[PDB]
mmCIF file of C-alpha atoms and ligand atoms in Angstrom:
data_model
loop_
_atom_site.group_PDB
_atom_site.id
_atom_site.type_symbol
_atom_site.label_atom_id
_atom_site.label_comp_id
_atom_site.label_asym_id
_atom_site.label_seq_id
_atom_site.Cartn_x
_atom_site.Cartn_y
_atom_site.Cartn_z
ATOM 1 C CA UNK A 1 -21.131 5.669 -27.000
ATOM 2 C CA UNK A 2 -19.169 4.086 -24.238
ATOM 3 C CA UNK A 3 -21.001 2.477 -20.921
ATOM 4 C CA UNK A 4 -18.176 3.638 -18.218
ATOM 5 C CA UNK A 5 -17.269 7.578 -18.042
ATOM 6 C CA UNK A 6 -20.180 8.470 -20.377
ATOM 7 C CA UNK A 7 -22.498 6.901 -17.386
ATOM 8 C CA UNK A 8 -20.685 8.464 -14.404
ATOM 9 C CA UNK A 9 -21.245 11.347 -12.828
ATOM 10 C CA UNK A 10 -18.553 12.873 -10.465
ATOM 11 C CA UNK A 11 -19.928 14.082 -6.765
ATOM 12 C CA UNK A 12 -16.955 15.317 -4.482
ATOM 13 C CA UNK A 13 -13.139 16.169 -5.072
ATOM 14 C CA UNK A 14 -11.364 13.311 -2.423
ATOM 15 C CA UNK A 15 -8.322 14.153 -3.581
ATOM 16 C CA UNK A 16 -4.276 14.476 -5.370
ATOM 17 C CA UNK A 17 -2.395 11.400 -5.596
ATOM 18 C CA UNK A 18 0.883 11.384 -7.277
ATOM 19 C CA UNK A 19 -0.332 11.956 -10.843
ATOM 20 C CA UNK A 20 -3.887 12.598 -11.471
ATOM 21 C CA UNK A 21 -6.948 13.370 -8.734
ATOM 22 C CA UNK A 22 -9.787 11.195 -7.221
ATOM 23 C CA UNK A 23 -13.369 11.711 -6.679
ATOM 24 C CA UNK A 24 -16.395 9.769 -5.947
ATOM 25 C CA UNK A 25 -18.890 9.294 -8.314
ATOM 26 C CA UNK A 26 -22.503 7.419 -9.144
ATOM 27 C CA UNK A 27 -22.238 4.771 -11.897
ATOM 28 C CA UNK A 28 -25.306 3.091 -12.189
ATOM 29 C CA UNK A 29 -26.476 4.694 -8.606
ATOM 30 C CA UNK A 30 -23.882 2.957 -7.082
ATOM 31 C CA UNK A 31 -20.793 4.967 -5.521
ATOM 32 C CA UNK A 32 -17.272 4.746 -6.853
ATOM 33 C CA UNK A 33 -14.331 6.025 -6.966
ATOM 34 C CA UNK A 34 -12.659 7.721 -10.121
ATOM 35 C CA UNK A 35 -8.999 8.668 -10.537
ATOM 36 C CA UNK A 36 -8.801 11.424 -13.271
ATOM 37 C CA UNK A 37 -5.153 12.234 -15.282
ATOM 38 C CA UNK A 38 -5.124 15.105 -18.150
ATOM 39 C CA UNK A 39 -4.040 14.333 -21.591
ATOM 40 C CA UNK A 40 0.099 14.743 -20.688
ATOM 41 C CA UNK A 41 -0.411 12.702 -17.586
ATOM 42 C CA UNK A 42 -1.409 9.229 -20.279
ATOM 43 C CA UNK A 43 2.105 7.387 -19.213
ATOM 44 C CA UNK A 44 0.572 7.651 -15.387
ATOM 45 C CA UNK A 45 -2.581 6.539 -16.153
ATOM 46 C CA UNK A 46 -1.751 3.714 -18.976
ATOM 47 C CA UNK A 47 0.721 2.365 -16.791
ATOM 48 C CA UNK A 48 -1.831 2.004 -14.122
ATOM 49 C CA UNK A 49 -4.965 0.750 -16.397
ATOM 50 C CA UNK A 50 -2.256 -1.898 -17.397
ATOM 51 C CA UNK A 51 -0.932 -3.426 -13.475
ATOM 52 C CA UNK A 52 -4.768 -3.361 -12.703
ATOM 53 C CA UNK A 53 -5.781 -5.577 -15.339
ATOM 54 C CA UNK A 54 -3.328 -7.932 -15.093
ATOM 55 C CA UNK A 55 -4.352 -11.396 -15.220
ATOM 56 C CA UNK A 56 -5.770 -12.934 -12.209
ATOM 57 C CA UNK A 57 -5.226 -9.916 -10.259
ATOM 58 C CA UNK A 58 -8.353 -9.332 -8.503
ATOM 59 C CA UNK A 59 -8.331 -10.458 -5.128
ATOM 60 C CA UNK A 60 -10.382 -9.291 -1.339
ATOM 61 C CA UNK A 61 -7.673 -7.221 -0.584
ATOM 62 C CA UNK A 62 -6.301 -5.353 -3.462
ATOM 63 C CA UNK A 63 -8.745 -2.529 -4.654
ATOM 64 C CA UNK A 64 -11.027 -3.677 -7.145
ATOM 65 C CA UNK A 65 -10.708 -2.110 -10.468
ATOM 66 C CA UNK A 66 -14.059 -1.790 -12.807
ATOM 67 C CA UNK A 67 -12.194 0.186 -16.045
ATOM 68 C CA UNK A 68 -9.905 2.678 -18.076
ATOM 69 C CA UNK A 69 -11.921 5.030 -20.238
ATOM 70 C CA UNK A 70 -11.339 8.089 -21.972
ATOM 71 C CA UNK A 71 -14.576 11.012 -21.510
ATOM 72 C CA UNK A 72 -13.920 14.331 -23.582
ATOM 73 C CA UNK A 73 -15.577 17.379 -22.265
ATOM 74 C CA UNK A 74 -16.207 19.369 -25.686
ATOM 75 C CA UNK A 75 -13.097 20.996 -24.614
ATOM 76 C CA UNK A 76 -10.564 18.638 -23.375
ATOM 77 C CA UNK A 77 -9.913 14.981 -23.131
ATOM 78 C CA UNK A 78 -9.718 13.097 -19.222
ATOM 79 C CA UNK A 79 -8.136 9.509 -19.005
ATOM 80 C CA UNK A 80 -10.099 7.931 -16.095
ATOM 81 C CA UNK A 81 -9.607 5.392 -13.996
ATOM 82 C CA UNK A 82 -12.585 3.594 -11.905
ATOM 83 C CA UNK A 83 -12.835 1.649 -8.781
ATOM 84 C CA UNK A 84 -14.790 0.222 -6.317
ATOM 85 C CA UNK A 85 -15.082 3.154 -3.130
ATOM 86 C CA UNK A 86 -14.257 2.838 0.107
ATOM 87 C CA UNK A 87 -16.168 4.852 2.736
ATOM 88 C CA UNK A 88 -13.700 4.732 5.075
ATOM 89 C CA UNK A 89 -11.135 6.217 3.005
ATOM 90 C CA UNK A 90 -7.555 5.533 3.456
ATOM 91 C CA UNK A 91 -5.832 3.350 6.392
ATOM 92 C CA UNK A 92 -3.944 6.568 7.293
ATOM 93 C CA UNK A 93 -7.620 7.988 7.704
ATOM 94 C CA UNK A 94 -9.191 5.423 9.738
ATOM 95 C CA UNK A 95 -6.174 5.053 12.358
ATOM 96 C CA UNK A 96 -6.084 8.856 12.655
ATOM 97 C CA UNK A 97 -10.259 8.678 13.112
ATOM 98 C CA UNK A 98 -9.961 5.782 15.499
ATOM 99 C CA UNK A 99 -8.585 3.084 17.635
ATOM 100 C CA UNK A 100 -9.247 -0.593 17.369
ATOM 101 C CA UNK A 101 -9.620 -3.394 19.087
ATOM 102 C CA UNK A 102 -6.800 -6.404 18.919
ATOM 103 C CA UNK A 103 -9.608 -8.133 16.655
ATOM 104 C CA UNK A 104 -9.568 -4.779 14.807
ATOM 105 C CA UNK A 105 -5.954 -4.755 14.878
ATOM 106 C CA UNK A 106 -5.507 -8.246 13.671
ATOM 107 C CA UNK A 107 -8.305 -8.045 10.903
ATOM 108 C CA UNK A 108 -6.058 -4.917 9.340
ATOM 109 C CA UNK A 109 -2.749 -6.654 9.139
ATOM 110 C CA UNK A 110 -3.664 -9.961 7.767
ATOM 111 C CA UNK A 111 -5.665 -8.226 4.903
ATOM 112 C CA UNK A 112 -2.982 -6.247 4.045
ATOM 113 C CA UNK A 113 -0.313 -9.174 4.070
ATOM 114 C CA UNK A 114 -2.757 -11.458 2.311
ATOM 115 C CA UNK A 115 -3.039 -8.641 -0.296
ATOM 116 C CA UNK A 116 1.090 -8.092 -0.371
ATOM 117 C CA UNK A 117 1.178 -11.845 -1.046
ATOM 118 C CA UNK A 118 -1.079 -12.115 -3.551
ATOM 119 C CA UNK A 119 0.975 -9.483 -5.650
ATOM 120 C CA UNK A 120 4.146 -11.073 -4.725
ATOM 121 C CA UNK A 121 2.471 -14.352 -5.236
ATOM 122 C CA UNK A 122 3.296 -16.213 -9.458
ATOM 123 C CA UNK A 123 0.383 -18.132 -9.893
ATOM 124 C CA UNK A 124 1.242 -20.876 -12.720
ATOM 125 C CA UNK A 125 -0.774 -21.314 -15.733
ATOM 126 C CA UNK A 126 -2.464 -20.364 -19.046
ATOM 127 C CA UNK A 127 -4.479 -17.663 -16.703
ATOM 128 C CA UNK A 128 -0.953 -17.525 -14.953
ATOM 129 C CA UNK A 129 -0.371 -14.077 -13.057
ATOM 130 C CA UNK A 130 3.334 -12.906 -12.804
ATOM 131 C CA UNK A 131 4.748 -11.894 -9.644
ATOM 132 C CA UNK A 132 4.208 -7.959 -8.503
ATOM 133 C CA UNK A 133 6.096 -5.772 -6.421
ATOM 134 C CA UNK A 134 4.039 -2.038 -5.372
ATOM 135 C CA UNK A 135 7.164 -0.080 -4.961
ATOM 136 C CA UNK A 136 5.167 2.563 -2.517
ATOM 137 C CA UNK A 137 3.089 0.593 0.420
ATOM 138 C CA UNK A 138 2.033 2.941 2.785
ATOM 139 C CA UNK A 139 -1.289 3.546 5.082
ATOM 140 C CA UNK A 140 -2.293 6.104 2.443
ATOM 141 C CA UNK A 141 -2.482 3.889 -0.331
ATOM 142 C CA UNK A 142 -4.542 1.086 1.597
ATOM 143 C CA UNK A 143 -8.577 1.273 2.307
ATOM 144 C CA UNK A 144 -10.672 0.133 4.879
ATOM 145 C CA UNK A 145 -13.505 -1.569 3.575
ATOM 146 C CA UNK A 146 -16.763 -1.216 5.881
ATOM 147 C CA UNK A 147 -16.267 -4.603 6.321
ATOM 148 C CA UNK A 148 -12.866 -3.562 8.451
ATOM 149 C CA UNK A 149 -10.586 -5.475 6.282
ATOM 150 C CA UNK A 150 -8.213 -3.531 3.552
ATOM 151 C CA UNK A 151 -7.115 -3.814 0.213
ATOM 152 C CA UNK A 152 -4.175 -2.195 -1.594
ATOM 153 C CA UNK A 153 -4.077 0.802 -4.398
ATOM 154 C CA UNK A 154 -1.987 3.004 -5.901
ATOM 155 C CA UNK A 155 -0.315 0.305 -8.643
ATOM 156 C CA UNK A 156 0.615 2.826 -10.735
ATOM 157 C CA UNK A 157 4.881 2.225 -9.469
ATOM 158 C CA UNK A 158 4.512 -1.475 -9.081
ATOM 159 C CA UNK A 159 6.447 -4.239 -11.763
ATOM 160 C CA UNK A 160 5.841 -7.740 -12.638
ATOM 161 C CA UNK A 161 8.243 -10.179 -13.457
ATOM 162 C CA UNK A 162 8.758 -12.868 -15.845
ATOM 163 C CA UNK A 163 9.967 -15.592 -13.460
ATOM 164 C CA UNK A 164 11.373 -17.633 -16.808
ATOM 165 C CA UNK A 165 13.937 -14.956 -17.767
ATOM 166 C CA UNK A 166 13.835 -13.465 -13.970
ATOM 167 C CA UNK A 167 13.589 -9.645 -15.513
ATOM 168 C CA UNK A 168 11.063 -7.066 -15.246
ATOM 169 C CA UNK A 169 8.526 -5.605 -17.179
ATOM 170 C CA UNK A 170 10.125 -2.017 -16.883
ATOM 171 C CA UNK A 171 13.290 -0.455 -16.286
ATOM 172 C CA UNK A 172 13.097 1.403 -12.989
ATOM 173 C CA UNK A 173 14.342 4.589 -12.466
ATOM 174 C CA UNK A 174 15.801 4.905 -8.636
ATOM 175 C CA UNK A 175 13.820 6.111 -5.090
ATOM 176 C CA UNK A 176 10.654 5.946 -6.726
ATOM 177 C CA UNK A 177 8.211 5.939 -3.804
ATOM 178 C CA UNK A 178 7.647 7.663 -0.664
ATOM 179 C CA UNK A 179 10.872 8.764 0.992
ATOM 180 C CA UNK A 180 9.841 8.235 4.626
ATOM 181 C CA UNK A 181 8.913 4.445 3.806
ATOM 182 C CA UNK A 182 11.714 3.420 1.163
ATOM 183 C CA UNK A 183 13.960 0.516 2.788
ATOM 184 C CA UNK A 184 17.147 1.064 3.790
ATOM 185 C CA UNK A 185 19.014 -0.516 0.297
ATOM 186 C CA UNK A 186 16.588 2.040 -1.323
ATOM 187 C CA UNK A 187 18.119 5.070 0.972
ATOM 188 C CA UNK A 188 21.689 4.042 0.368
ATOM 189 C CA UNK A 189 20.835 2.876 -3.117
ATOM 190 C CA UNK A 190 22.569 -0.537 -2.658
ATOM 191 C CA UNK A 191 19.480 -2.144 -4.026
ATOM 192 C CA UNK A 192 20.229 -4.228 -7.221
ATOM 193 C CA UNK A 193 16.970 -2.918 -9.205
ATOM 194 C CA UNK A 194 17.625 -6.304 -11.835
ATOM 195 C CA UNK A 195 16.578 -9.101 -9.351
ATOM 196 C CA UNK A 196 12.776 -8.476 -9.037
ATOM 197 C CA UNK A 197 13.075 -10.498 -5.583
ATOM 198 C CA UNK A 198 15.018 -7.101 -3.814
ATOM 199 C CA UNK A 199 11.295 -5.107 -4.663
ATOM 200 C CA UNK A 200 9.170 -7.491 -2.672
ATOM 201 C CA UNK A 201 12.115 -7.197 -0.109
ATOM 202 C CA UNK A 202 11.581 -3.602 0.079
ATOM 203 C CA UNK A 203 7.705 -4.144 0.254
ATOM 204 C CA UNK A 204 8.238 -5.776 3.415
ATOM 205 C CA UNK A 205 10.297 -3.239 5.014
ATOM 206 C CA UNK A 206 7.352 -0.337 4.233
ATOM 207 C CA UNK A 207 4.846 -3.069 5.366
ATOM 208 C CA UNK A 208 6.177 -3.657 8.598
ATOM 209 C CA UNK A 209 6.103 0.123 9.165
ATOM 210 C CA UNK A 210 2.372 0.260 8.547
ATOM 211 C CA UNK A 211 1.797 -2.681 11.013
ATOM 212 C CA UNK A 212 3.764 -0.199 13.932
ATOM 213 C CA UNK A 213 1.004 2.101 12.184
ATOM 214 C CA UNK A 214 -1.796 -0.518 13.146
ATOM 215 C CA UNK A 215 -0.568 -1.100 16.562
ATOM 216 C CA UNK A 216 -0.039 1.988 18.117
ATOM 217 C CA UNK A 217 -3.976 2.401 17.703
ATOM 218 C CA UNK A 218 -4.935 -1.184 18.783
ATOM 219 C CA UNK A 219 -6.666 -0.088 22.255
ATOM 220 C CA UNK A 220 -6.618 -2.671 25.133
ATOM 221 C CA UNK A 221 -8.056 -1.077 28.941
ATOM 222 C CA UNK A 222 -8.188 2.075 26.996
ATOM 223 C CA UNK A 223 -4.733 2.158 26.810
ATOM 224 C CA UNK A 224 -2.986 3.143 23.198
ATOM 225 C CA UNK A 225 -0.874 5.314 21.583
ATOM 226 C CA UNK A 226 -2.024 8.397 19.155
ATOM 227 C CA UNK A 227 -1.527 8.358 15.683
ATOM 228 C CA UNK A 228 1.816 8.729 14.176
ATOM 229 C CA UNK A 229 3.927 8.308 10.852
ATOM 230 C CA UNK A 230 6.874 6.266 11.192
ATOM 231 C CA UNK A 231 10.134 7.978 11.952
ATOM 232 C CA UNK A 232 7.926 11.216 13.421
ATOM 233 C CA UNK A 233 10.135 11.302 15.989
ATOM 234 C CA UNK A 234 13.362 11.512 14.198
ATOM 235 C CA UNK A 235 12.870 13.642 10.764
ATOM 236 C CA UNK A 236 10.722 16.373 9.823
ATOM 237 C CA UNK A 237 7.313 16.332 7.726
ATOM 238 C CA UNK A 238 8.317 15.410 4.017
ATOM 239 C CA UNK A 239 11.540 14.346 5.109
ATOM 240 C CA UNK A 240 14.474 14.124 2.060
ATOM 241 C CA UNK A 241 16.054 10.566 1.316
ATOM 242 C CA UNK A 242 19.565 12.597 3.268
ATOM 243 C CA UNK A 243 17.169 12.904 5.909
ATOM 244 C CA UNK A 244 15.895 9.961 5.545
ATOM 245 C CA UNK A 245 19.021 7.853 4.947
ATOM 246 C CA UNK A 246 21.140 9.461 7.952
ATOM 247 C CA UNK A 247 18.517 8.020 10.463
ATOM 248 C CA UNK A 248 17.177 4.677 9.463
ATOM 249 C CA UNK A 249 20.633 3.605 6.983
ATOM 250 C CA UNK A 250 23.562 5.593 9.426
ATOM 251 C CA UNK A 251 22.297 5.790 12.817
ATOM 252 C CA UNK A 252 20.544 2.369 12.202
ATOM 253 C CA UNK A 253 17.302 3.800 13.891
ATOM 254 C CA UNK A 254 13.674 1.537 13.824
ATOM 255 C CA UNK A 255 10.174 3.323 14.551
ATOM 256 C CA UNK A 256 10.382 2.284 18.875
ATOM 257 C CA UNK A 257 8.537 -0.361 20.126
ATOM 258 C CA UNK A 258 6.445 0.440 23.250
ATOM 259 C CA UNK A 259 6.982 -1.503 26.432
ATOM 260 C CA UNK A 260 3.227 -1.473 26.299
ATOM 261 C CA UNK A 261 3.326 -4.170 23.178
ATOM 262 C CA UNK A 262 4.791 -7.011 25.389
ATOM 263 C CA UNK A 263 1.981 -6.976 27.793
ATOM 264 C CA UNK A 264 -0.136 -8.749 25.264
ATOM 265 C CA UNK A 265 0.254 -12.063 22.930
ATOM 266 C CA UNK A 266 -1.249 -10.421 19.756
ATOM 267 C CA UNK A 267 0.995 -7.225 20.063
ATOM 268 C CA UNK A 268 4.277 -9.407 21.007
ATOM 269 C CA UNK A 269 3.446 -11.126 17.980
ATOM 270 C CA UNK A 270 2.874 -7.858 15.806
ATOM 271 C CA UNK A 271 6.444 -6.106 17.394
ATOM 272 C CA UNK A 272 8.312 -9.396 16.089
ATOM 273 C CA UNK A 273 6.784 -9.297 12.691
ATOM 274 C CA UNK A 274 7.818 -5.359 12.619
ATOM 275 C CA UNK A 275 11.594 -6.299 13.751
ATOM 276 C CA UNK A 276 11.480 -9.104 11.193
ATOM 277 C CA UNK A 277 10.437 -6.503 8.212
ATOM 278 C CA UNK A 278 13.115 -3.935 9.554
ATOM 279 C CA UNK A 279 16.442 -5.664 9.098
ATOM 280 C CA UNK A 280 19.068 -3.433 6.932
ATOM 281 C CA UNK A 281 19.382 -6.844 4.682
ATOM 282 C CA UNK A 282 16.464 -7.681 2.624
ATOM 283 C CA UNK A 283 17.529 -10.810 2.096
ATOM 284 C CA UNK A 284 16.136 -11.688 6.012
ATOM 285 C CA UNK A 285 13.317 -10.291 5.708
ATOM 286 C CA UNK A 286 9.733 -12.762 6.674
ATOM 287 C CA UNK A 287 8.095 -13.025 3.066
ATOM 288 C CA UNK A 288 4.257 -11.757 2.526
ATOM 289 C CA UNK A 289 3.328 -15.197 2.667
ATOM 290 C CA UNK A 290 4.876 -16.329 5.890
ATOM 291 C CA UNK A 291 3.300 -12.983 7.555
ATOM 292 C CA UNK A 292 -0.044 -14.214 6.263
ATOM 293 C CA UNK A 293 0.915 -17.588 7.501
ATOM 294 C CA UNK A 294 1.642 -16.385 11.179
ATOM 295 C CA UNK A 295 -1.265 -13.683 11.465
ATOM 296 C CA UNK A 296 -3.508 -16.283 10.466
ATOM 297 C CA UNK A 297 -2.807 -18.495 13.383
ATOM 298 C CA UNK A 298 -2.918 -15.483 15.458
ATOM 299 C CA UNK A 299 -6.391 -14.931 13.573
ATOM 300 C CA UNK A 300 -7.693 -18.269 14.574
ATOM 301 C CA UNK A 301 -5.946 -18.659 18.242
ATOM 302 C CA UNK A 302 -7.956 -14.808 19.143
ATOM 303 C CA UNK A 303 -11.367 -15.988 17.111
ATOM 304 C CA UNK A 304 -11.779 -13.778 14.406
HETATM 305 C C1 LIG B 1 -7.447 2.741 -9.829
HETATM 306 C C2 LIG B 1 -8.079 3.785 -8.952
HETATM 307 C C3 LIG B 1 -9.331 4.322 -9.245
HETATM 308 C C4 LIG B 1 -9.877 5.246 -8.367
HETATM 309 C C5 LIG B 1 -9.203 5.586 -7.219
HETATM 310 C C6 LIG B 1 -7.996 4.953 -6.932
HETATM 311 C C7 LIG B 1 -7.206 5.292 -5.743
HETATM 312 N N1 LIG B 1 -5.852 5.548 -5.731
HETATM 313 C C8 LIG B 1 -5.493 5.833 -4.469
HETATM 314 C C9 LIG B 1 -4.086 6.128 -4.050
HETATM 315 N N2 LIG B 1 -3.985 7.052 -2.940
HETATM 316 C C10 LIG B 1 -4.360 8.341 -3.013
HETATM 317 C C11 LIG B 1 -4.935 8.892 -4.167
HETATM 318 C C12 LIG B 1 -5.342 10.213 -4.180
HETATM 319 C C13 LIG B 1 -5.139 11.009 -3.083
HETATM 320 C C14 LIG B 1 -4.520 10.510 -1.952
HETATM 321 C C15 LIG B 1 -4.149 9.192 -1.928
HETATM 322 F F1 LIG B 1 -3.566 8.652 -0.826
HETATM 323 N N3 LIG B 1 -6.548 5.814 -3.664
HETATM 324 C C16 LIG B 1 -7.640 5.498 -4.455
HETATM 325 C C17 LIG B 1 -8.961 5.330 -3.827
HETATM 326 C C18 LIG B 1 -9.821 4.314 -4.236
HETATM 327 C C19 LIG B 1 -11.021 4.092 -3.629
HETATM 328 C C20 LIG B 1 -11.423 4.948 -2.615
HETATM 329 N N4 LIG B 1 -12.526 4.965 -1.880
HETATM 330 C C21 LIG B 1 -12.351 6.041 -1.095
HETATM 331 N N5 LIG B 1 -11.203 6.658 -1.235
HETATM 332 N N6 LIG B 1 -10.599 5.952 -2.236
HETATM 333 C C22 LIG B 1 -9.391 6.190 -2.821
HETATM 334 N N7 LIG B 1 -7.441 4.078 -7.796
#
């Protein structure tokens, strides 16, 4: 038989993503974490198997993926997927469990751009890797690693594209994703879904709403903010894209930036990267790459 689900044995429900449901298990006595789909759920979980093994994927901050397996039951058959676990849990966990420290802070938003930029990132080559956009960033689908650094999951929406032709691997349907974080061309539905370049555009916009995640935890003389989902203050839980769109594509609103954030070098430089993800045109937008670029001088100036 098989050496992956055969070998595995499940230990506690985590939880329902979008299609499927994860638990931790023991593989070889070591703890991971296994995303289960049924039998009419095998476009979900294919789909998945296939972003994660793209070539050259694997990288410190995007979830590492062991396998895709089938296990039958005697009854039924499951489509699993495994992957490395994550004490910690989600980003949206940890900054609801606790506040950092601007080190903290820091360490959280350059793993998560240097992960963004790696999937936006072509690398050239007979082991090339195409460029990939996620399609649904948010602090749920990020983990902390104990190390205090994160790396991106959920793939399961993203698309790579074949820079030659400059077209896409799928043909996407419209506001996929999470409706509080979709960009404002996703909202209005102005985005132009055949250049690949407007998904890692919208990336951006959901990234820089996870760094004003980050930094209303990031502690300094005690001082912080508690935990909130962007827009909290301006739509209701499981907000609609109406909702949705009337605030952040009408009214033109941002998540606000405390006063608090220009008393210190490393939060100044956080607000500016969030107003530089939230423009209504894509097209201005800092790349992954130039994020990475600027947190890692911030990395080095604060000793990291
Ligand atoms: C490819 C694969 C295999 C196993 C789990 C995941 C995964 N997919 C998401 C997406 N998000 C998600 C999902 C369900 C419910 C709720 C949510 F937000 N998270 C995880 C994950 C991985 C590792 C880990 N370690 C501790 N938790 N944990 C969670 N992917």
């Amino acid at each position: 038989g098989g050496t992956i689900a055969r070998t595995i044995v499940l230990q506690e429900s985590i939880g329902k993503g979008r299609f499927g449901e994860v638990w931790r298990g023991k593989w070889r006595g070591e703890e991971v974490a296994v995303k289960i789909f049924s039998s009419r759920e095998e476009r979900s979980w294919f789909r998945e198997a296939e972003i994660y093994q793209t070539v050259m994927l694997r990288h410190e901050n995007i979830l590492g993926f062991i396998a895709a397996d089938n296990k039958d039951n005697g009854t039924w058959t499951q489509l699993w997927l495994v992957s490395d676990y994550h004490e910690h849990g989600s980003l949206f966990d940890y900054l609801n469990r606790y506040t950092v420290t601007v080190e903290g802070m820091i360490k959280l938003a350059l793993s998560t751009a240097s992960g963004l930029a790696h999937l936006h990132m072509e690398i050239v080559g007979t082991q090339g890797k195409p460029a990939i956009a996620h399609r649904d960033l948010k602090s749920k689908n990020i983990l902390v690693k104990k190390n205090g650094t994160c790396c991106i999951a959920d793939l399961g929406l993203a698309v790579r594209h074949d820079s030659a032709t400059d077209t896409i691997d799928i043909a996407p349907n419209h506001r996929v994703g999470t409706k509080r974080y979709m960009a404002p061309e996703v909202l209005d539905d102005s985005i132009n879904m055949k250049h690949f370049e407007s998904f890692k555009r919208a990336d951006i916009y959901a990234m820089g709403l996870v760094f004003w995640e980050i930094a209303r935890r990031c502690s300094i003389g005690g001082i912080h903010e508690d935990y909130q989902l962007p827009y909290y203050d301006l739509v209701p839980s499981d907000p609609s894209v109406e909702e949705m769109r009337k605030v952040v594509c009408e009214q033109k609103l941002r998540p606000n930036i405390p006063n608090r954030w220009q008393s210190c070098e490393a939060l100044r430089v956080m607000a500016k990267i969030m107003r530089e993800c939230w423009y209504a045109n894509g097209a201005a937008r800092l790349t992954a790459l130039r994020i990475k670029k600027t947190l890692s001088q911030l990395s080095q100036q604060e000793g990291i």
